[PDB]
Amino acid sequence: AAKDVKFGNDARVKMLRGVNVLADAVKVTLGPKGRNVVLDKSFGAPTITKDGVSVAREIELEDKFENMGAQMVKEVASKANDAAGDGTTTATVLAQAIITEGLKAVAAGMNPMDLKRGIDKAVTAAVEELKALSVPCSDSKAIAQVGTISANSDETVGKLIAEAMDKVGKEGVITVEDGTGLQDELDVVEGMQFDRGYLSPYFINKPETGAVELESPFILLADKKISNIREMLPVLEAVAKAGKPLLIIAEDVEGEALATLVVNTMRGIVKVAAVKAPGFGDRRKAMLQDIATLTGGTVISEEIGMELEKATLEDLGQAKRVVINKDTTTIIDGVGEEAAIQGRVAQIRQQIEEATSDYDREKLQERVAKLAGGVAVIKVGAATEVEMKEKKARVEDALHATRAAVEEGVVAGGGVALIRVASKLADLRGQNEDQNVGIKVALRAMEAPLRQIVLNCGEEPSVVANTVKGGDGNYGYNAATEEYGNMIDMGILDPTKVTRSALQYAASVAGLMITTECMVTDL
Amino acid sequence: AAKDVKFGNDARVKMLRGVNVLADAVKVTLGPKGRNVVLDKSFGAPTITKDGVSVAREIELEDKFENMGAQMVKEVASKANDAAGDGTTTATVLAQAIITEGLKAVAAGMNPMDLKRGIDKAVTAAVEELKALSVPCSDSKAIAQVGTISANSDETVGKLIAEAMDKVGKEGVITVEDGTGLQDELDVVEGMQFDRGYLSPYFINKPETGAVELESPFILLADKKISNIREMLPVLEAVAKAGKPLLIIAEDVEGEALATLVVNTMRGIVKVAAVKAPGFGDRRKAMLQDIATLTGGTVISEEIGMELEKATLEDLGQAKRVVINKDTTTIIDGVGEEAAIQGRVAQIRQQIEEATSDYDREKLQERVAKLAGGVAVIKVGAATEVEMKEKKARVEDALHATRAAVEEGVVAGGGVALIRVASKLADLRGQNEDQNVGIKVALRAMEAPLRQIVLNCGEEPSVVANTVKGGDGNYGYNAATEEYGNMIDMGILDPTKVTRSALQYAASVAGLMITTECMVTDL
Amino acid sequence: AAKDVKFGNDARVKMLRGVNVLADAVKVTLGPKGRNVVLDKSFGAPTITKDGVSVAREIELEDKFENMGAQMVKEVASKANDAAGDGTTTATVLAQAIITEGLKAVAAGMNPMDLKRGIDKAVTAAVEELKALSVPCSDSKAIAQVGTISANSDETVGKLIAEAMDKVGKEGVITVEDGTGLQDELDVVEGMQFDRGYLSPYFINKPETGAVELESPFILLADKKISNIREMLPVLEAVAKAGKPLLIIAEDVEGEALATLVVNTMRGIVKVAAVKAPGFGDRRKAMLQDIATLTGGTVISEEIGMELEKATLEDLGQAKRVVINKDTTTIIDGVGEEAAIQGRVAQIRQQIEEATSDYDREKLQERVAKLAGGVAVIKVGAATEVEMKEKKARVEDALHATRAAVEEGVVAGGGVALIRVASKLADLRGQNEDQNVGIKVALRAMEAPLRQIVLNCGEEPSVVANTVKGGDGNYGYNAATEEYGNMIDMGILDPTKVTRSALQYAASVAGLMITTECMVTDLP
Ligand SMILES: Nc1ncnc2c1ncn2[C@@H]1O[C@H](COP(=O)(O)OP(=O)(O)O)[C@@H](O)[C@H]1O
Ligand SMILES: Nc1ncnc2c1ncn2[C@@H]1O[C@H](COP(=O)(O)OP(=O)(O)O)[C@@H](O)[C@H]1O
Ligand SMILES: Nc1ncnc2c1ncn2[C@@H]1O[C@H](COP(=O)(O)OP(=O)(O)O)[C@@H](O)[C@H]1O
Ligand SMILES: [K+]
Ligand SMILES: [K+]
Ligand SMILES: [Mg+2]
Ligand SMILES: [Mg+2]
Ligand SMILES: [Mg+2]
């Protein structure tokens, strides 16, 4: 009292109303037949939209309690979108479906801990069914279909990503850069990606991107654990007139050594970063000289007879742009060399025929692909900059979904996946009636996505849900045409990772929400 | 309680009310015998305009939801005006007629999606008859009549436009410039129009014109895909003391080179733009040298032996003004040459006697017209600058409307065209009762313009509407004189694109209003 | 008047609030450590009571949807008392528990009707099991104990009830009334007596005693008014020759006749006294025939056409002695024939079997007791009237409890009976899983009485309830001493009738109420 503090049921019922108001604004846009929501634009001509994310972002309820219910749901929905490139609205709608019955059933006096345990049991079991249902992402055709769906059925995006994957292979690194002009373009350049990131948070980027990138960086290739960089300072000072950044790749990023010294080298006013070389031992040596050829640098070490005092601006590698995150780095376009790379790749290829000792065979057979086909760079063109930004975002999210799909396969989309597994878990039961109500509420929510999508079409949801449950395999309702058919033949594919993630996160909040007992907020 | 978020009928009912206040303010002005609207002005002496556009501007409702209902209708009306030079109020009236009946039927619980589908069916069917009713703009008299009706019966404007088109021909490019004095003037100068615009948004103009124009521009006529402009900076720097702009017209506007380098050339402080030469290959060559003669330039290319290092300010063309849009370019008046053009045109005409090969016949037979009649420039004279500004604006709309009429012909004005097709489609029926009522709503709305015109005139709409439906052909009611007669002989003509466009846009909003479910607006 | 309507959970929550508000007011009285409730009555001093039904009847709530709940459960609290007297508090606690747990299961989405049938099945089995546990009660020690327990642990009341039921026998009728001493008193009446005194003081032969006593008197029963001495002469003549005294029973004695007897008595010609007939109406005729039977006399009445002028010494009844007070008449050792008296008793007992009204039925028991047993009066002693209505109510409830005990047996008190029967039904099942829940909800609620008894003491309820279920037989928890033991050795006994009654009526109401879907009532 006397502050907006309240306890027990008086708290929950405020949240319930908050979540419900948010959800009613989102679910109406779910699927391809979303029905318009109007958002006020201060200048007039209010923007008319069919996008869940664009709607859910605007809502800032004025009641300080109802706001919180909205924000925590919005929050988790966004995190599911970061795990996989879609499903913001799916997670939101599922969250309403579970939470609604959860808060009512607790208000009837059920034990909230048993409800939590019951929901968690059902969701944990269901995830195992998805693992059995998933099929591998067999071909670039599926890549295309996954792409379009992620892009509101924009075919064009899918062809680019499909084509890009054809140049560099499904697993190859793809990057997107702003439009050179009216029309899209695709090209390949001698980049270099490896699975090492920056080890210190102070190497964070200036923008909030989490990953950091350096433009026109020099590349130091120090093939030892670097106990001393003082002999590099004259080179940095000669570069300091230009300010050109330095990225460090090291056999080890020795902490009290080079890493500390680099951290001391900048007061925020020097562009430096450091990462380990990829692999271990001879692999770091090998890929350090690979990067040297790719960047036009040389390997630094005393065993090579190459002190940092000797390191000219051409013994250091160089690249036009490079990106680093918490765990990963990619060179996009090293200045590099032509014939030296061709010869080294041929030598590495020859080594594959002899370095067949299993884990050594790998290092060769990746490194050949590390040099050749460095990176493909999509250029996004549109009639105006407004569409260019829009298209770019669409492409970038579409890209993510495709990667998620190829990493963990696809399942029949359009909500059939959830309604399918719901039939198989129906026999599951808990230790007591509280858990049984927990189990039932979980399986009730799993049907909500299909029922919502169809209802938007202007259809009787009851008939379709029965028909899809009575069917078998990937038989389902194609909302885009009102025809029934096989989703895999129809190309309605959802990446398994987004569906799994959207379920787990929604259930986490619902369980997390049940066990809230007090809030402390300002008047 | 909450932010002003609200759903379903509670939202729609607000929209309906907002739309109605707007339409009732505007619809009373429709037709040549409108009724006065007293627009307020803070200085006193209110303006009392009869102009629907002027009234539509000010309407700005207090109640946020009521406001939104007005603004979206207002917006779509404006888009209709940009598509064709009239029909703002016609589109508004049709919008109100559909919306009102639509929302009523929805509130009764009619399936909203089925209602939409019904509307779009009738509109799609109806346009086919309008296509059939169109007739060619055969003669300057039809030009004039379309003009006057577009200019509130100002015969002056129709005469001016008629004369200008008689000078340069219907297809020829015409421009309007501020008055040189008390009296209107018309004259011709060596302009050149071709349907190529600037390929990058960063060449957008400073004002909001969308198109961009350059005054006293220099013209580069580069007959290759320009992979390198570095050799031009010395010429541009020599010009930078005067700041006279340079336009690049290229055989190809090379994307990653020419465009990127040009983009890099200006930091918002250099007047540079680039466009493709018209046609392909030898066509671009031909018209490039045409432009060269018209501008006093020369063709740039290594095969010609004219590097940009060699390109003086007289190998570059010059003009006093040039205009560029998203899809089209015209030079207004190149500095050019006299006898060189005359000899060139004569040669082209001679080539027409031998360029019988059709891909040449079409490439030759235009270029002759490209030289002669380059542009006509109407000067609008008036007794005051206030009348000047208003008058020019009207002339510009009459210009737009005339182009529309020549593009898609004309049909009987005064609502006769809509009420005619409405009678033909009375047999049209849909798959179910929800779609059937949807059809009835659309066919009723299409009659609204005629009944609104006559009602403003202070006559009995029942009798006139029945008489026009009992007639045949272009028979109709002349509101300016209350005589019945053949509309075409009285010159009451509307460009078909105006009627076609206004109907489709009204339907689109009406369809889009039925299927809205939620609002978001600030407190 | 305009109605208001509510649906679904928005109705049941309001209803549940009402029942709980009533039930908590009753609950607090339960068990030996329960506490008193103060009842406002506008006429005068408020009355404090422990009787659960007394409070429950007075409760009514302002909010209509809350009031509906109280007004329904009020029935169980009342009906239990009407049926069996004691045990109304228990019935209430059960009802609230079943409603709470039943409605909770409905929130899980179970079909309500299947819960109802499940509960009804569980009670039907449990009542049958109680018939197995019940053991006969007949000895004076057990009756004394069950009296004490119902009295709220007053040994004195128990002892008085045990002696009273012994003296008047099983057919005798016992009644309780407001006394005047500080200490309780028992009055016992033997033989026929009725509340009519001598019509004149001058009959008084023992003025120091203030009463008339007559030896071996003739008893004349005239079904008519005495108005003219002409009617009486032959009987007086015959009795005067016989010399035995005569008592007149008549509808009235007119002053002329009355004064003539007064002269004859004062002058010592005939010893005679006259009294009004008891009661009035047809019951007067019945009672006249009954006293006639006890005396072996004959009722002279105009309906049979008999005449007092024709009555004979053979028609009058006889008794060894009579005594009549200012307000009371008693007849000692009527010469009526035992077999005829017994046959008359059988006829009236057949009327008792036919008696549709328990109040009328009681007046018949009074008659059979007056004819063939005794009647006793218990006078409650206390210093102030608020103590009268306190003590009075508890003594009253003991009287009902002991009756039900002797006529149906006893079971271990302290609610342990319900605990021990509930465990036996663990294997009972219904036609479907919803009925299985309905069964389990019923067996769960049967623990509620024990949990409340303990909780009033401030002990931890769920530890006692667990440990009692760990035992076997009559092992239970004695709240008075806070020790475990065999309930029968402490004599903590409940008469099976009340327990069985409380269960059936509780489940009958609650098992319906949970099915409520809509409630309609006037706007406030
Ligand atoms: N042609 C289609 N038929 C049926 N369902 C579709 C079709 N295309 C997409 N969907 C479904 O739309 C859902 C996603 O809708 P969307 O508006 O992207 O919400 P979110 O952004 O939260 O994923 C997915 O479940 C997807 O399978
Ligand atoms: N003499 C006339 N008789 C009948 N209708 C006319 C006449 N002149 C113009 N109109 C009609 O007026 C309508 C447009 O009115 P206007 O005031 O221009 O509104 P808007 O500017 O929105 O078109 C056209 O449909 C046109 O055919
Ligand atoms: N000494 C005792 N120990 C434990 N339980 C007792 C004791 N005396 C009475 N009880 C129990 O308390 C209840 C009687 O209390 P009472 O206030 O009369 O409630 P009710 O009005 O429902 O009979 C019975 O269940 C009886 O078995
Ligand atoms: K959508
Ligand atoms: K007008
Ligand atoms: Mg999506
Ligand atoms: Mg107009
Ligand atoms: Mg009791």
Swiss-Prot record, chains A, B:
Q: Does the keyword Nucleotide-binding apply?
A: yes
Q: According to the UniProt entry, which residues carry N6-acetyllysine? A: K116
**Keyword Cytoplasm in record:** yes
Single GO molecular function: ATP-dependent protein folding chaperone
Tell me how this protein assembles: Forms a cylinder of 14 subunits composed of two heptameric rings stacked back-to-back. Interacts with the co-chaperonin GroES. Can form asymmetrical complexes, composed of one GroEL and one GroES, and symmetrical complexes, formed between one GroEL and two GroES oligomers. The asymmetrical complex is the functional unit. It was suggested that the symmetric heterooligomer may represent a transient intermediate in the chaperonin protein folding cycle.
The family classification in the record reads: Belongs to the chaperonin (HSP60) family.
Q: Which NCBIfam families match?
A: GroEL, PRK00013.1, PRK12849.1, PRK12850.1, PRK12851.1
Give a short account of what the protein does. Together with its co-chaperonin GroES, plays an essential role in assisting protein folding. The GroEL-GroES system forms a nano-cage that allows encapsulation of the non-native substrate proteins and provides a physical environment optimized to promote and accelerate protein folding, probably by preventing aggregation and by entropically destabilizing folding intermediates.
- Kindly provide the name given to this protein in its UniProt entry: Chaperonin GroEL
